[model samples]
Target: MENLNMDLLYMAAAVMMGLAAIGAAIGIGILGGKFLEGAARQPDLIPLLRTQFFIVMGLVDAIPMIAVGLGLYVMFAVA
Candidate 1:
């Protein structure tokens, strides 16, 4: 029974990680695409756009980081 529970826990963790990665990839792709379009249209504002791009990237990455932290917590704290 304990082994069964462990297996389930691992499976759940794997699913969570997979979904987190998928979300992060899609978000970053869209964010980068828009940044590129904006930069292309406003070449003179490239520096400003680059700064905003980094900021947005960081924001988008926060979710994945949280997911990772939660996963570690489950691994170490739960099981």
Candidate 2:
């Protein structure tokens, strides 16, 4: 029964990583959709928007990478 705590810890780490990925996915999905909409409306801003979008998108994508690292740490160290 003592291992239950560690089991829960494992699940928690997985949840943390999953939530981060899902959040990033939703964030980028909406941001990309809106950016496309806006770009369609104003084609001239496309280049600038593309540049800015990638920057913001990279930031958004970083969360899961960090989470993956932290989650791995948690699983390896906490256990």
Off by more than 4 A, model 1 = 44-79
- Estimate TM-scores for all models: 0.46, 0.53
TM-score (C-alpha) between model 1 and the true structure: 0.46
* Among all candidates shown, the one with the greatest lDDT: 2
Across residues 1-79, which tens digit of lDDT does each residue of candidate 2 receive? Answer: 5677666666665666556555566666776667666666665566566847654775666576657757665765655
* lDDT (C-alpha, whole model) for all candidates: 0.61, 0.63
lDDT by residue (8-78, candidate 1, tens digit) is 65665555555555555566666655766667666656656674665566556656755775676487457
Clashes per model (N, Cα, C within 3 A): 0, 0
Candidate 1: worst-modelled 10 consecutive residues by lDDT: 15-24
Residue runs of model 2 more than 4 Å from their true location after superposition: 44-78
User: In model 1, what lDDT does residue 70 have?
Assistant: 67
lDDT of 1: 0.61
